[PDB]
């Protein structure tokens, strides 16, 4: 197996409550060991391991490097957030909501597929005859498709009575009002 030597540099920005809290963390990484860090809360380079000590001391001795890094939370993070506000943070893709019955016979499982939505924040609930079901609900984790959409499968273990209406109920920032999709038991299982 060929040997490989890897370097990573990550200029990371953290935002909370709009730009009320903004934090820059610059990370230099050898293979998977973070070795040097610039955290705007700290205001100087810090050696995370011994391998990063010479770089941290050397960069901290360079006044021009320090003041650029210290301004970078505004110059980079806050500047780019204004662009995100007009683009990524405005991205609304409404979820597609689909119910299909399954087994694990007669049907004893319903799968609510909630697909192709953005952003990630979502609330999916199962109702049976207008009463929220809590037991018997199993969800996949939030699934990242990689194309700026997510999906999630929320499953309900069920023993259906003929006439029962099972409702998948989805809340999402793209929606003025929840999506509800109904599955109506046509027989008793």
């Amino acid at each position: 197996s060929p040997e490989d030597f890897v370097y990573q540099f990550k200029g990371m920005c953290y935002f909370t409550n709009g730009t009320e809290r903004v934090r820059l963390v610059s990370r230099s990484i050898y293979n998977r060991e973070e070795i040097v860090r610039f955290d705007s809360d700290v205001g100087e380079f810090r050696a995370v391991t011994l391998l990063g000590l010479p770089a941290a001391e050397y960069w901290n001795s360079q006044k021009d490097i320090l003041e650029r890094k210290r301004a970078a939370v505004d110059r980079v993070c806050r500047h780019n957030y204004q662009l995100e506000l007009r683009t990524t943070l405005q991205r609304r893709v409404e979820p597609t909501v689909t119910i299909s019955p399954s087994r694990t016979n007669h049907h004893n499982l319903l799968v609510c597929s909630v697909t192709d939505f953005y952003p990630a924040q979502i609330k999916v609930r199962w109702f049976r005859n207008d009463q929220e079901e809590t037991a018997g609900v199993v969800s996949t984790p939030l699934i990242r498709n990689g194309d700026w959409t997510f999906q999630i499968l929320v499953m309900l273990e069920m023993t259906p009575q003929r006439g029962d209406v099972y409702t998948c109920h989805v809340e999402h920032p793209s929606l003025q009002s929840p999506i509800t999709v109904e599955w109506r038991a046509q027989s008793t299982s």
Partner: T-cell receptor
Amino acid sequence: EVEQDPGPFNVPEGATVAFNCTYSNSASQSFFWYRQDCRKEPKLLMSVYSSGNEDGRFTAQLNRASQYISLLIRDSKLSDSATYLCVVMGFQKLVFGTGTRLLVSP
Amino acid sequence: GVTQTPRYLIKTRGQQVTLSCSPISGHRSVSWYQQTPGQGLQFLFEYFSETQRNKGNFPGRFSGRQFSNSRSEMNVSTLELGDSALYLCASSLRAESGELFFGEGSRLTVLE
């Protein structure tokens, strides 16, 4: 781990005093001497550098090869009587030494 | 410099106490340390931007907080005899600084 001269220094006024301190973590980044009068608060005395920080009667120096930190007090005054703390900063840990007490007699 | 109140306090075992620290104007990091004979300086908790940034090894009856003016409070919900100490706060402009400015401390004596 920070280890200091483990005992009271009883020194006549005017003598020159050497404090020593060792640290075990090679990754330790910054180093300081603090000064603390009896039952009072610590006060930053000086940062420590490999060149040797010099400021009046005080000199502090770092040796990364041996992982030693030192403080020199030339021409000691009665007012130098205090507990001298070696303070070592590593990644997310600032460690205060237990201190070396210095008593300057007239 | 750094202002701490109350400067002296007598409490009894089982009581609660709140100590207050006003850092140097402009400083945003406040740390609390406990000073006893025989252990020296022990780090309680550091507070930056109104949240606890780092924590020492003290039990949970020791708690703290930081307000939006960077003033900080320390609390012990239930005091023990061995909590008698000089409680020192230290401020620095930025987080995780080795360059600290200490108040004069709150001298707390806990009696039965």
